[PDB]
Design a protein around this motif. Sequence first.
Motif, PDB file in Angstrom:
ATOM      1  N   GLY A   1       0.809  -1.206   0.000  1.00  0.00           N
ATOM      2  CA  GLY A   1       0.000   0.000   0.000  1.00  0.00           C
ATOM      3  C   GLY A   1       0.847   1.264   0.000  1.00  0.00           C
ATOM      4  N   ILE A   2       1.886   1.288   0.832  1.00  0.00           N
ATOM      5  CA  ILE A   2       2.701   2.488   0.976  1.00  0.00           C
ATOM      6  C   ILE A   2       3.349   2.813  -0.369  1.00  0.00           C
ATOM      7  CG2 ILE A   2       4.636   3.536   2.200  1.00  0.00           C
ATOM      8  CD1 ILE A   2       3.901   1.586   4.563  1.00  0.00           C
ATOM      9  N   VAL A   3       3.901   1.804  -1.051  1.00  0.00           N
ATOM     10  CA  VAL A   3       4.556   2.060  -2.328  1.00  0.00           C
ATOM     11  C   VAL A   3       3.514   2.499  -3.359  1.00  0.00           C
ATOM     12  CG1 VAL A   3       6.428   0.443  -1.824  1.00  0.00           C
ATOM     13  CG2 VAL A   3       4.575  -0.273  -3.350  1.00  0.00           C
ATOM     14  N   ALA A   4       2.325   1.888  -3.331  1.00  0.00           N
ATOM     15  CA  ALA A   4       1.269   2.214  -4.278  1.00  0.00           C
ATOM     16  C   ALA A   4       0.710   3.600  -4.031  1.00  0.00           C
ATOM     17  CB  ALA A   4       0.169   1.207  -4.190  1.00  0.00           C
ATOM     18  N   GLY A   5       0.710   4.053  -2.769  1.00  0.00           N
ATOM     19  CA  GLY A   5       0.161   5.350  -2.438  1.00  0.00           C
ATOM     20  C   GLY A   5      -1.354   5.312  -2.316  1.00  0.00           C
ATOM     21  N   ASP A   6      -1.929   4.103  -2.361  1.00  0.00           N
ATOM     22  CA  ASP A   6      -3.355   3.941  -2.249  1.00  0.00           C
ATOM     23  C   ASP A   6      -3.650   2.605  -1.626  1.00  0.00           C
ATOM     24  OD1 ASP A   6      -6.108   4.440  -2.689  1.00  0.00           O
ATOM     25  OD2 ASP A   6      -5.792   5.123  -4.712  1.00  0.00           O
ATOM     26  N   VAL A   7      -4.870   2.443  -1.092  1.00  0.00           N
ATOM     27  CA  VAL A   7      -5.244   1.255  -0.363  1.00  0.00           C
ATOM     28  C   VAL A   7      -5.739   0.184  -1.316  1.00  0.00           C
ATOM     29  CG1 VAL A   7      -5.652   2.349   1.851  1.00  0.00           C
ATOM     30  CG2 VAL A   7      -7.535   2.255   0.126  1.00  0.00           C
ATOM     31  N   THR A   8      -5.942   0.514  -2.569  1.00  0.00           N
ATOM     32  CA  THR A   8      -6.523  -0.404  -3.538  1.00  0.00           C
ATOM     33  C   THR A   8      -5.778  -1.745  -3.517  1.00  0.00           C
ATOM     34  OG1 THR A   8      -5.739   1.417  -5.027  1.00  0.00           O
ATOM     35  CG2 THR A   8      -7.835   0.138  -5.797  1.00  0.00           C
ATOM     36  N   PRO A   9      -4.432  -1.797  -3.645  1.00  0.00           N
ATOM     37  CA  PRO A   9      -3.731  -3.083  -3.626  1.00  0.00           C
ATOM     38  C   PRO A   9      -4.056  -3.874  -2.364  1.00  0.00           C
ATOM     39  CG  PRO A   9      -2.226  -1.249  -3.258  1.00  0.00           C
ATOM     40  CD  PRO A   9      -3.522  -0.657  -3.791  1.00  0.00           C
ATOM     41  N   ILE A  10      -4.031  -3.181  -1.220  1.00  0.00           N
ATOM     42  CA  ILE A  10      -4.360  -3.775   0.063  1.00  0.00           C
ATOM     43  C   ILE A  10      -5.780  -4.318  -0.010  1.00  0.00           C
ATOM     44  CG2 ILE A  10      -4.341  -3.492   2.560  1.00  0.00           C
ATOM     45  CD1 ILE A  10      -2.695  -1.034   2.339  1.00  0.00           C
ATOM     46  N   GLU A  11      -6.691  -3.500  -0.532  1.00  0.00           N
ATOM     47  CA  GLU A  11      -8.118  -3.761  -0.464  1.00  0.00           C
ATOM     48  C   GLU A  11      -8.485  -5.030  -1.219  1.00  0.00           C
ATOM     49  OE1 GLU A  11     -10.197  -1.975  -3.460  1.00  0.00           O
ATOM     50  OE2 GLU A  11     -11.329  -3.708  -3.484  1.00  0.00           O
ATOM     51  N   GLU A  12      -7.970  -5.194  -2.454  1.00  0.00           N
ATOM     52  CA  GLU A  12      -8.327  -6.356  -3.240  1.00  0.00           C
ATOM     53  C   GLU A  12      -7.866  -7.647  -2.561  1.00  0.00           C
ATOM     54  OE1 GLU A  12      -6.809  -3.981  -6.172  1.00  0.00           O
ATOM     55  OE2 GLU A  12      -8.717  -3.109  -5.916  1.00  0.00           O
ATOM     56  N   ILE A  13      -6.640  -7.664  -2.032  1.00  0.00           N
ATOM     57  CA  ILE A  13      -6.086  -8.900  -1.503  1.00  0.00           C
ATOM     58  C   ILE A  13      -6.692  -9.244  -0.140  1.00  0.00           C
ATOM     59  CG2 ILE A  13      -3.984 -10.196  -1.031  1.00  0.00           C
ATOM     60  CD1 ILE A  13      -2.524  -8.016  -2.731  1.00  0.00           C
ATOM     61  N   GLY A  14      -6.987  -8.235   0.691  1.00  0.00           N
ATOM     62  CA  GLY A  14      -7.231  -8.485   2.104  1.00  0.00           C
ATOM     63  C   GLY A  14      -8.591  -8.026   2.627  1.00  0.00           C
ATOM     64  N   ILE A  15      -9.233  -6.989   2.059  1.00  0.00           N
ATOM     65  CA  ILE A  15     -10.346  -6.405   2.779  1.00  0.00           C
ATOM     66  C   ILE A  15     -11.689  -6.821   2.173  1.00  0.00           C
ATOM     67  CG2 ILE A  15      -8.826  -4.400   3.307  1.00  0.00           C
ATOM     68  CD1 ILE A  15     -12.055  -3.487   1.837  1.00  0.00           C
ATOM     69  N   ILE A  16     -11.725  -7.427   0.987  1.00  0.00           N
ATOM     70  CA  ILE A  16     -13.010  -7.776   0.396  1.00  0.00           C
ATOM     71  C   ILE A  16     -13.267  -9.260   0.636  1.00  0.00           C
ATOM     72  CG2 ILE A  16     -13.450  -5.902  -1.232  1.00  0.00           C
ATOM     73  CD1 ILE A  16     -12.027  -7.350  -3.359  1.00  0.00           C
ATOM     74  N   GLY A  17     -14.386  -9.538   1.309  1.00  0.00           N
ATOM     75  CA  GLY A  17     -14.729 -10.896   1.687  1.00  0.00           C
ATOM     76  C   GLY A  17     -14.053 -11.311   2.990  1.00  0.00           C
ATOM     77  N   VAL A  18     -13.336 -10.383   3.641  1.00  0.00           N
ATOM     78  CA  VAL A  18     -12.594 -10.718   4.844  1.00  0.00           C
ATOM     79  C   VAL A  18     -13.572 -11.165   5.927  1.00  0.00           C
ATOM     80  CG1 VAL A  18     -12.479  -8.270   5.592  1.00  0.00           C
ATOM     81  CG2 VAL A  18     -10.930  -9.931   6.594  1.00  0.00           C
ATOM     82  N   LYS A  19     -14.696 -10.444   6.065  1.00  0.00           N
ATOM     83  CA  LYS A  19     -15.684 -10.750   7.084  1.00  0.00           C
ATOM     84  C   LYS A  19     -16.154 -12.186   6.897  1.00  0.00           C
ATOM     85  CE  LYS A  19     -15.647  -6.505   8.695  1.00  0.00           C
ATOM     86  NZ  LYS A  19     -16.152  -6.337  10.048  1.00  0.00           N
ATOM     87  N   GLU A  20     -16.503 -12.531   5.657  1.00  0.00           N
ATOM     88  CA  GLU A  20     -17.052 -13.835   5.338  1.00  0.00           C
ATOM     89  C   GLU A  20     -16.043 -14.934   5.645  1.00  0.00           C
ATOM     90  OE1 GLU A  20     -17.498 -10.815   3.876  1.00  0.00           O
ATOM     91  OE2 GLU A  20     -18.450 -11.171   1.930  1.00  0.00           O
ATOM     92  N   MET A  21     -14.784 -14.712   5.254  1.00  0.00           N
ATOM     93  CA  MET A  21     -13.743 -15.701   5.465  1.00  0.00           C
ATOM     94  C   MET A  21     -13.578 -15.955   6.960  1.00  0.00           C
ATOM     95  SD  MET A  21      -9.632 -15.523   4.854  1.00  0.00           S
ATOM     96  CE  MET A  21      -9.708 -14.130   5.986  1.00  0.00           C
ATOM     97  N   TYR A  22     -13.452 -14.882   7.735  1.00  0.00           N
ATOM     98  CA  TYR A  22     -13.204 -15.029   9.161  1.00  0.00           C
ATOM     99  C   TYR A  22     -14.423 -15.629   9.849  1.00  0.00           C
ATOM    100  CZ  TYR A  22      -8.508 -13.021   9.388  1.00  0.00           C
ATOM    101  OH  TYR A  22      -7.167 -12.816   9.245  1.00  0.00           O
ATOM    102  N   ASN A  23     -15.634 -15.282   9.403  1.00  0.00           N
ATOM    103  CA  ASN A  23     -16.824 -15.849  10.016  1.00  0.00           C
ATOM    104  C   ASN A  23     -16.866 -17.360   9.806  1.00  0.00           C
ATOM    105  OD1 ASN A  23     -17.722 -13.397  11.085  1.00  0.00           O
ATOM    106  ND2 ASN A  23     -18.844 -12.914   9.198  1.00  0.00           N
ATOM    107  N   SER A  24     -16.493 -17.845   8.618  1.00  0.00           N
ATOM    108  CA  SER A  24     -16.426 -19.283   8.428  1.00  0.00           C
ATOM    109  C   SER A  24     -15.375 -19.869   9.368  1.00  0.00           C
ATOM    110  CB  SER A  24     -16.156 -19.684   6.998  1.00  0.00           C
ATOM    111  OG  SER A  24     -14.787 -19.494   6.661  1.00  0.00           O
ATOM    112  N   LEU A  25     -14.216 -19.216   9.471  1.00  0.00           N
ATOM    113  CA  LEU A  25     -13.159 -19.696  10.345  1.00  0.00           C
ATOM    114  C   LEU A  25     -13.606 -19.608  11.805  1.00  0.00           C
ATOM    115  CD1 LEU A  25     -10.100 -18.044   8.525  1.00  0.00           C
ATOM    116  CD2 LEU A  25     -10.819 -20.441   8.509  1.00  0.00           C
ATOM    117  N   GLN A  26     -14.453 -18.614  12.106  1.00  0.00           N
ATOM    118  CA  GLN A  26     -14.968 -18.349  13.441  1.00  0.00           C
ATOM    119  C   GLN A  26     -13.977 -17.493  14.237  1.00  0.00           C
ATOM    120  OE1 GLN A  26     -17.715 -19.781  17.194  1.00  0.00           O
ATOM    121  NE2 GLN A  26     -15.489 -19.598  17.209  1.00  0.00           N
ATOM    122  N   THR A  27     -12.906 -17.050  13.581  1.00  0.00           N
ATOM    123  CA  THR A  27     -11.981 -16.096  14.169  1.00  0.00           C
ATOM    124  C   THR A  27     -12.752 -14.818  14.504  1.00  0.00           C
ATOM    125  OG1 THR A  27     -10.019 -16.958  13.145  1.00  0.00           O
ATOM    126  CG2 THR A  27     -10.046 -14.608  13.466  1.00  0.00           C
TER     127      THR A  27
END
Lengths: 144, 161, 161, 161, 161, 160, 160, 160, 160, 64
Positions: free
Chosen positions: G94-120
């Motif tokens: 993200g820091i090199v990109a200057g935007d959260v988009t790279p972060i967002e695609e890999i980590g923040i979309i569907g994160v809730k769903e993934m963790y809820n299945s895991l139960q984390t």
Amino acid sequence: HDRYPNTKVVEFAFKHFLGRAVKNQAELIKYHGLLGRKGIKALIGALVDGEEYGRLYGEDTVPSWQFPTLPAANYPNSVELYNRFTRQDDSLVVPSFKPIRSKMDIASMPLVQAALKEQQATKTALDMSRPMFLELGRSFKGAD
Amino acid sequence: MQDAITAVINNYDVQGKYLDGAALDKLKAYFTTGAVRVRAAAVISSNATTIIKEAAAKALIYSDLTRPGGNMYTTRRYAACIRDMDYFLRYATYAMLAGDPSILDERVLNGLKETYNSLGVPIAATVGGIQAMKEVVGGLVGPDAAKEASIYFDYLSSGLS
Amino acid sequence: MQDAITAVINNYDVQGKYLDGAALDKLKAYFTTGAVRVRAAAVISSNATTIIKEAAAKALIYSDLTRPGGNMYTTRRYAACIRDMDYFLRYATYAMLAGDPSILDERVLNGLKETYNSLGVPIAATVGGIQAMKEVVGGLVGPDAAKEASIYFDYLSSGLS
Amino acid sequence: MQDAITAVINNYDVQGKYLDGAALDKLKAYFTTGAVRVRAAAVISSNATTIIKEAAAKALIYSDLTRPGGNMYTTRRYAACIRDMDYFLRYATYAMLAGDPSILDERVLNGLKETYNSLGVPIAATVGGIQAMKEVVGGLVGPDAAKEASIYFDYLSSGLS
Amino acid sequence: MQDAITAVINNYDVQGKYLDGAALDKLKAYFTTGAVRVRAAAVISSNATTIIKEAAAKALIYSDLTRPGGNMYTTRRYAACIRDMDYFLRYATYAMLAGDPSILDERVLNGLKETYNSLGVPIAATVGGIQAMKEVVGGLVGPDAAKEASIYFDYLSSGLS
Amino acid sequence: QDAITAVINNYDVQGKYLDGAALDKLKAYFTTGAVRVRAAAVISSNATTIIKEAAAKALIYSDLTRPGGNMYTTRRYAACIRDMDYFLRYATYAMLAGDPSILDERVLNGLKETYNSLGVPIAATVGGIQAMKEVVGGLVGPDAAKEASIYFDYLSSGLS
Amino acid sequence: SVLTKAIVNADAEARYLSPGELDRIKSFVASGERRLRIAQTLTEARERIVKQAGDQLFQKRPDVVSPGGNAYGEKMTALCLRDLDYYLRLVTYGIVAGDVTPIEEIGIIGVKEMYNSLQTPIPAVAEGVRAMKNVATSLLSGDDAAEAGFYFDYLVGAMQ
Amino acid sequence: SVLTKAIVNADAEARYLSPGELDRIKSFVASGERRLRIAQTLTEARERIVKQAGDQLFQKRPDVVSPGGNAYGEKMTALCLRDLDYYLRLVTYGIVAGDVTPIEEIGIIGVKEMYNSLQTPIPAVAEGVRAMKNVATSLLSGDDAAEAGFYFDYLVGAMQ
Amino acid sequence: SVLTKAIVNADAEARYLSPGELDRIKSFVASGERRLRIAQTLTEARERIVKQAGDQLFQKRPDVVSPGGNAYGEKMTALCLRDLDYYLRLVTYGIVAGDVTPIEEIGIIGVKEMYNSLQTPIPAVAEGVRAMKNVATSLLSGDDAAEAGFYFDYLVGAMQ
Amino acid sequence: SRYFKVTACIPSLKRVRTGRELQNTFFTKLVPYENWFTEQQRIQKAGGKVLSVKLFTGVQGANT
Ligand SMILES: *[C@H](C)[C@H]1/C(=C/c2[nH]c(/C=C3N=C(/C=C4\NC(=O)C(CC)=C4C)C(C)=C\3CCC(=O)O)c(CCC(=O)O)c2C)NC(=O)[C@@H]1C
Ligand SMILES: *[C@H](C)[C@H]1/C(=C/c2[nH]c(/C=C3N=C(/C=C4\NC(=O)C(CC)=C4C)C(C)=C\3CCC(=O)O)c(CCC(=O)O)c2C)NC(=O)[C@@H]1C
Ligand SMILES: *[C@H](C)[C@H]1/C(=C/c2[nH]c(/C=C3N=C(/C=C4\NC(=O)C(CC)=C4C)C(C)=C\3CCC(=O)O)c(CCC(=O)O)c2C)NC(=O)[C@@H]1C
Ligand SMILES: *[C@H](C)[C@H]1/C(=C/c2[nH]c(/C=C3N=C(/C=C4\NC(=O)C(CC)=C4C)C(C)=C\3CCC(=O)O)c(CCC(=O)O)c2C)NC(=O)[C@@H]1C
Ligand SMILES: *[C@H](C)[C@H]1/C(=C/c2[nH]c(/C=C3N=C(/C=C4\NC(=O)C(CC)=C4C)C(C)=C\3CCC(=O)O)c(CCC(=O)O)c2C)NC(=O)[C@@H]1C
Ligand SMILES: *[C@H](C)[C@H]1/C(=C/c2[nH]c(/C=C3N=C(/C=C4\NC(=O)C(CC)=C4C)C(C)=C\3CCC(=O)O)c(CCC(=O)O)c2C)NC(=O)[C@@H]1C
Ligand SMILES: *[C@H](C)[C@H]1/C(=C/c2[nH]c(/C=C3N=C(/C=C4\NC(=O)C(CC)=C4C)C(C)=C\3CCC(=O)O)c(CCC(=O)O)c2C)NC(=O)[C@@H]1C
Ligand SMILES: *[C@H](C)[C@H]1/C(=C/c2[nH]c(/C=C3N=C(/C=C4\NC(=O)C(CC)=C4C)C(C)=C\3CCC(=O)O)c(CCC(=O)O)c2C)NC(=O)[C@@H]1C
Ligand SMILES: *[C@H](C)[C@H]1/C(=C/c2[nH]c(/C=C3N=C(/C=C4\NC(=O)C(CC)=C4C)C(C)=C\3CCC(=O)O)c(CCC(=O)O)c2C)NC(=O)[C@@H]1C
Ligand SMILES: *[C@H](C)[C@H]1/C(=C/c2[nH]c(/C=C3N=C(/C=C4\NC(=O)C(CC)=C4C)C(C)=C\3CCC(=O)O)c(CCC(=O)O)c2C)NC(=O)[C@@H]1C
Ligand SMILES: *[C@H](C)[C@H]1/C(=C/c2[nH]c(/C=C3N=C(/C=C4\NC(=O)C(CC)=C4C)C(C)=C\3CCC(=O)O)c(CCC(=O)O)c2C)NC(=O)[C@@H]1C
């Protein structure tokens, strides 16, 4: 010297001053080299000064036909030389030693082959001295 | 002569390529095998006289060859034959350490057929002796070494025949 | 070796004939050419190193041969090739003075093909180099001398091929 | 779409590798080029109408296409063709800023060939127009910018053809 | 010649061993690859003329070879060279179906070097052409097939070298 | 021959078994060995230069090189530099060996007589050897220099 | 990245890049070299950041590493740390990109769903990221830390 | 290689390998893995080593890249750099082999003759190799550098 | 010793010592200290080794110490033991040298001829050496014994 | 051409010889100048000791 090409000249010199044919291509190079870029008088002088001459003929013995077992083609080659009468055949007994191809690759040999399987198969597993969290995150396929 | 390390180098040199990881892996493979090879070589050197004795007993001796008019008849000829056997053994040991069959081609194999034909030495009997030595050697060296040892012996045999 | 003068003599000697006017004219022809040949030989000797350099530049170098996997690759092989080139030049000069091609046959030409085939040296490339040397030599010697020089170079080329 | 910075990131992400100096160097390279690109983009935007005019003059107009029975005959068709030209220019400018050809593939290039073939628009003429725009653009942007601009124009041309 | 199935059988027969699981595994491996190979072979046969054309364009034509004094100069020589290219392609296809390099050794590789040397055909250029064909073939066959196809092409190249 | 063998030979003539005092001398050699190996590699790499520098210091710009001097004419000049090379090579061998004997067996034997017949000047040759020593001393470094110096001095004394 | 975002806005408007948009691009390219160094620093300190943050998280949340809790056990604890490592890698990107988009695609979309299945528990994950931020801030210089903080804050905001 | 050398000595003596010789082979195979890494390092840095060495050489010898000089002109300068690259490749081969023989056959025999025909100055070539050594040494760790140095020194000695 | 051998090969080639050759010298000097200890052990136990071996030999061969036999009588028996002592001394010399050459020159050349004039049976002498080996092996540690064994074996081979 | 008269003694260290071989042990010989260098080395390598060297023919320090 005068009616023979320089390679055949090195043959005859070996026959006459050591009693042998030329044992290997490295030897052909060294002597044939010196025959170019210097006299025949240099060639002759090098043989008689060299160690082979010194080991076996010494200072007081007349050279003789060696009939050598040892290096490899040496025995058959020498004996073709010894059998020829003067002027009977002028052709080189050894034009030069032809270099030999490889029949088998290094990997075909059993010990290497095995060691390759061991590194290749189970190249990717678990690394010790690596914290597990770093190991779980590590990727196996990488690219592709 | 050539050895496994040099063989890799030479292949790269003709390509003109710098050494690469794939090449490095082959070199690494050789290095691991090395320790085994050294142990095998020491075994062979110590038992060389016996290996020859056993092999001769298996194939050469008690035969027409040793009987008068046979190739190995007379002390001189007998001694020559066992000297040749020793040569084969020494060179095979060198090859095994090297990890390459090339030395056999360069020293032993080159001109041997022609030499033997002029001498009237029987090639098939010689091959038999080499095979016998192989069997004895296999036992002494032990299994891991045996496979490696066998290939060089077979290479000699194929060349002669 | 043989020269022009001796060649005439030898032909007469086998016949047993005393020297005759026709024979004398052939000898006379040689004597006129002689002075030119001597001048040419001196030119070649002085410029020999350069002649070889130029010819190599024209054919041998900047080529696959010099590149890895080529026959003239490695310093040792490169040096060998230029040594061979020098031989051809020296012998051609000798032949030109002599006025006879025989010396080329007796020293250079005999057994060269076989040697080269065992070595794996490429004959056509060598021939190319000889032809290149001829062209360079032709310039230095000048036109009258060039014709004489060319025949010996061509003789070498034909022998190798 | 993708940009140069993201392309580097994505390559590392599939490997799972943290960013390394070699990767950083590629990013650094982009950053230096960036300033030039921004200047070029502003030039193109201001001169866009003229660029299209000049390119049309070079290739499209005064031609059979504009003459009756030609693809660009009738006002409607003429207007369509210049609209397409504008699209190509805008997208190329976007690509130049991005430093990546991907956007061209995702928006412009995808399905265009098939559309044109059904319509009977001539692809080669369109490609000619793109090349003409490139030449005009090259002048305005200046040499350093031109090289960068050219690659995207060429990419469009290759896709269409 | 031999194919993979027969090669396994033959190796076992000389040993006198009945087929064993390790041997079976090699056979099983071949059987899975088989379907892919058949598809690849059909692709190559259909595109053979083009493959040769493309490869020639990449290496042989627009070169000194085609220019007067070059090996492939004159129609007769040009036709010969493309005929040889076709041979290599056909045999490599045979080898790929077979899963064994032996056919190449028995038919193509044996005596080729000697033939070429007598003819004065340049080996390195031929090798270049083979490598070019490989690249073209790789595209058409697709990736899974390409790996299999490549080994046979490389085998030919190594032999000629 | 070698320091190790020299000790052995001295014991053998006595018929004595090797003893601790003898062992200590051998041990001393073993420690020095590592230094010697490093020195030898330095000398081999810089051999051509060492000879050049030494010649510059003593042989050239001198009467010897001038007409009527011993080293006048190319043939004589070449001979002298060849001799210089041998002294250097043998000294290097001696340093590794740790024994002066090789110098006696190889270099020193028959040299004086040859030189006297030739009319080569011994003192000038000695001067050249001393010059080589000085150059060598620099390159090898101080610890190595002491060891190197003794063999050079041995050669010089023999020739004189 | 900044550039991707600008292009996308322009394409929606169907217009060439605005001067203002162009200016932001200019600013970004100048900032990039500084950004690269910030990213490099965190990469080098990655191993320690993760370790320290993990400890802090476990102190903050005893439950997660408890028999009931998801993190409990060596295998599970390793996975929790691996997750923290993943998020750190994303932040550097993200820091090199200057935007959260790279972060967002890999980590923040569907994160809730993934963790809820895991139960984390999602809040605990957020705490871990906060912990990592604090460690990272200490190693970074103040201005550098502020830049890094923004990306860290985004992650915490995305997953809560 | 070391092993080839040992075998060759044995064959000359017509004897099986001595235990001592066998031990040296064992040591070499153990060392090989370390040697491979050293070679790998130089291979990766090859492009930069050549470039840096070239520049140093041209600074050291203005003449070579002068209109009179052999190196002068683009074509010629490229060839000079290609030669430097060749020598570096040879050095890497040497390190893995543990012997100079691989280097020696490809590069040092007939080198004088080849360069004399080319008219390239041999001392300049030696300087280039020295320059490459210095660059290579810096990238290598000290003990690694010493190993690499030996091979580099041999080349410099050969071209003298 | 090994070092002498290396120097001699170099002198024949008329070349400075190769790096590989130098490395072997380095290895030998490191090994020497261990070798010295092995030799020291045998020297201390020398008196007992000879005595024990003698007894074994006489048991193995009653004939040698019989009125017909050469060894018979006090004077003769002493000489036989002296010979055994000589061979042991030679073996110790060999171990420190690291080569059989020292042993070989003093004891193995013309040995057949000497003993034939004396009329001493050569096989009996060989048995005595074998006996000494067994005694020596017991006192030595296993690895030390193997080293010592090689030298003992050589002697037995030589006297055959 | 310059000639060297050399007297040298070489011991037979490798093997005892049944043949008398007096000539091999002790020899006085005439050596061409060029040859002597190599010969001297060979005697040294053998371990023979050169008792005396003299220049039989030619003049010392002669340019031609
Ligand atoms: C008898 C006094 C001693 C003895 C003899 C013995 N010999 C063998 C076996 C062989 N001996 C020979 C010898 C010769 N072959 C020749 O050509 C010559 C010269 C003409 C001789 C003397 C050979 C060749 C053999 C091998 C067998 C064969 O002929 O094929 C043995 C048995 C072999 C074994 O060890 O198994 C024996 C016993 N043995 C003694 O101990 C006596 C002192
Ligand atoms: C650079 C330090 C110096 C320099 C270099 C230079 N070299 C050439 C041309 C060649 N050099 C080689 C060398 C090699 N070929 C081999 O096989 C090996 C070992 C693997 C080596 C080292 C060769 C063969 C050529 C010929 C070119 C060819 O491939 O045909 C040039 C160009 C000169 C020319 O006329 O070709 C140059 C400039 N020149 C200097 O003066 C520098 C000190
Ligand atoms: C140069 C134009 C080509 C070339 C030459 C090349 N030759 C060799 C090796 C040898 N060359 C000869 C040839 C001669 N010896 C003679 O007596 C004569 C007649 C006067 C000739 C011409 C010989 C005998 C050798 C072998 C021994 C030696 O090297 O002295 C090589 C080396 C081959 C090798 O593999 O080592 C080469 C390269 N090769 C080319 O590329 C040119 C076409
Ligand atoms: C005259 C009243 C005014 C004028 C005319 C003018 N036109 C052009 C160039 C073109 N005009 C057309 C027009 C058409 N193509 C079509 O298909 C149709 C409908 C059937 C029309 C109306 C085209 C295509 C061109 C371009 C050239 C071509 O035919 O390919 C010009 C020349 C301008 C130029 O630089 O190209 C001019 C002058 N201009 C005036 O000033 C008058 C008021
Ligand atoms: C001008 C250089 C050339 C030219 C252009 C031309 N195009 C059309 C018609 C269409 N062109 C497109 C193109 C696109 N649609 C898309 O979605 C995209 C990518 C996202 C592109 C670039 C399409 C779909 C049409 C049809 C509908 C429309 O125009 O909106 C025409 C007219 C064809 C008609 O019969 O309507 C023309 C003239 N043709 C040339 O000859 C020039 C070389
Ligand atoms: C012109 C009448 C027609 C035409 C010609 C054309 N030829 C090529 C390419 C080549 N032509 C040759 C032909 C020859 N080489 C020979 O040695 C001889 C006999 C002396 C001939 C006739 C060759 C070898 C080539 C290949 C290129 C090269 O020389 O390296 C082209 C180019 C097309 C291509 O794919 O290369 C063309 C266009 N084609 C026409 O359409 C004309 C009617
Ligand atoms: C093409 C890439 C190169 C080339 C080729 C070329 N080949 C010939 C002549 C022959 N080629 C062959 C080869 C084969 N016959 C076989 O059976 C096989 C294996 C299946 C092969 C590969 C043969 C035997 C010939 C001679 C008889 C014939 O022409 O059919 C030529 C003609 C050479 C001549 O002098 O006539 C040529 C030109 N030429 C190149 O330079 C390319 C690099
Ligand atoms: C001039 C064409 C080139 C040149 C010359 C140069 N020479 C020296 C030094 C010496 N030159 C000689 C030469 C001879 N001595 C002889 O006995 C003979 C044979 C009759 C010759 C030709 C000698 C012996 C020396 C050494 C010094 C001395 O005489 O005492 C130098 C100086 C180098 C130095 O470091 O001493 C130079 C410069 N230099 C060139 O580059 C020109 C092309
Ligand atoms: C140089 C420092 C001084 C010098 C030397 C010089 N030597 C000769 C000729 C010979 N020198 C030797 C010496 C050796 N031969 C050996 O075997 C060894 C041991 C390795 C040595 C040291 C010999 C035998 C000769 C004669 C033939 C030869 O060239 O070897 C000359 C030439 C004298 C002459 O009259 O030809 C010279 C000049 N003389 C000086 O000026 C320096 C002080
Ligand atoms: C004991 C194992 C056997 C034995 C020995 C024996 N030896 C002698 C006499 C001598 N032995 C030697 C031996 C050596 N002298 C040396 O210099 C060396 C090398 C270092 C050796 C091994 C010598 C020379 C003698 C002569 C006496 C002397 O040296 O003072 C005898 C006495 C017989 C006689 O006639 O002198 C004996 C008994 N005899 C056996 O049978 C045992 C198996
Ligand atoms: C024994 C009674 C004394 C003894 C002898 C001894 N001699 C040598 C060495 C040699 N002796 C000779 C003598 C001859 N060679 C001949 O041709 C003849 C006439 C036929 C004789 C008498 C020679 C030439 C040598 C040299 C070696 C060789 O093999 O030729 C030695 C060896 C000394 C050494 O160190 O080399 C010995 C011991 N010495 C004694 O102590 C006894 C009193």
